[PDB]
Amino acid sequence: DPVFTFGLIADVQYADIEDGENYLRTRRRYYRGSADLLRDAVLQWRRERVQCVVQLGDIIDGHNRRRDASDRALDTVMAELDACSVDVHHVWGNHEFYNFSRPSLLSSRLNSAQGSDLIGDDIYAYEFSPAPNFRFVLLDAYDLSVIGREEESEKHTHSWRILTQHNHNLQDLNLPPVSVGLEQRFVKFNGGFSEQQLQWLDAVLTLSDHKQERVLIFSHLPVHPCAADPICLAWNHEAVLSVLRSHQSVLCFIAGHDHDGGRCTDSSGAQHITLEGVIETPPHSHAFATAYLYEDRMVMKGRGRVEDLTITYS
Ligand SMILES: [Zn+2]
Ligand SMILES: [Zn+2]
Ligand SMILES: [Zn+2]
Ligand SMILES: [Zn+2]
């Protein structure tokens, strides 16, 4: 009998445009079909009587900005999610920032923050307890970024210095500085977590340790190299791992961004899960899950491209 049950989905990236491809032309992007997959996920979550949904970001594509349709695209996906009739928690990813400024995002339906939060500090991160002995933490992986901060701000300048110290492709910072190894991550479509944000995460986890809570952490960007392609990792992913490895309360770290997905268990026992992306899923397939938190284990039931997973608690 589960303590708590929630839906999970990543990288819907809806747009009312014809199918496209990724840069390397190795994956197709099913922009319109994403809304059909989202509608079906919602139907399934309704049957399951889920208590909330967490969506891992890139809910609408940056192409919407280029066709001046950002608001109508967001309306479309919000209408599908509203049909579920439960709280939806929204992680902000790179495509959110391509479409909207932070003040716009804060005033929008994508602000699910309303535990503790960092909104007053201009960081979109928050934590709450959905059920006894469990805690959810949503992180802002574009806290340090050039795409999610205002030109001339302290944080944008800091982020630009970090990015361009590692990536000399000033003419197109979406191109990685190398083709092999972890330095690929230093691209404009990624970001990192500020010292302020990490100090807060570390504090949340210390308190969770002492309360014997199990903590689930959600981020648009993955942080463990075993769980995602290096080009998809947070800029300071190792700083995050160092925090997680310090705390037995960490149950799992769940991310989107790498549409291929990935998963692994850290040497600490913490599970990293990178959800397969809806946008690169064809209509004959699927990509979403429902997670069940029991007193002794978490079971994730995946559909289509997402495989099931069970985490037995330490
Ligand atoms: Zn994406
Ligand atoms: Zn820094
Ligand atoms: Zn550096
Ligand atoms: Zn992304």
UniProtKB/Swiss-Prot annotation:
Keywords: Hydrolase, Metal-binding, Zinc. Zn(2+) 2 binds at residues 58, 94, 220, 257. This is Manganese-dependent ADP-ribose/CDP-alcohol diphosphatase. Belongs to the ADPRibase-Mn family. Its cofactor is Mg(2+). Monomer. GO terms for molecular function: 2',3'-cyclic-nucleotide 2'-phosphodiesterase activity; ADP-ribose diphosphatase activity; CDP-glycerol diphosphatase activity; manganese ion binding. Its EC number is 3.6.1.13, 3.6.1.16, 3.6.1.53. Zn(2+) 1 binds at residues 11, 13, 58, 259. It holds the Pfam family Metallophos. It catalyses: CDP-choline + H2O = phosphocholine + CMP + 2 H(+); ADP-D-ribose + H2O = D-ribose 5-phosphate + AMP + 2 H(+); CDP-glycerol + H2O = sn-glycerol 3-phosphate + CMP + 2 H(+). PANTHER family: MANGANESE-DEPENDENT ADP-RIBOSE_CDP-ALCOHOL DIPHOSPHATASE, PTHR16509. Hydrolyzes ADP-ribose, IDP-ribose, CDP-glycerol, CDP-choline and CDP-ethanolamine, but not other non-reducing ADP-sugars or CDP-glucose.
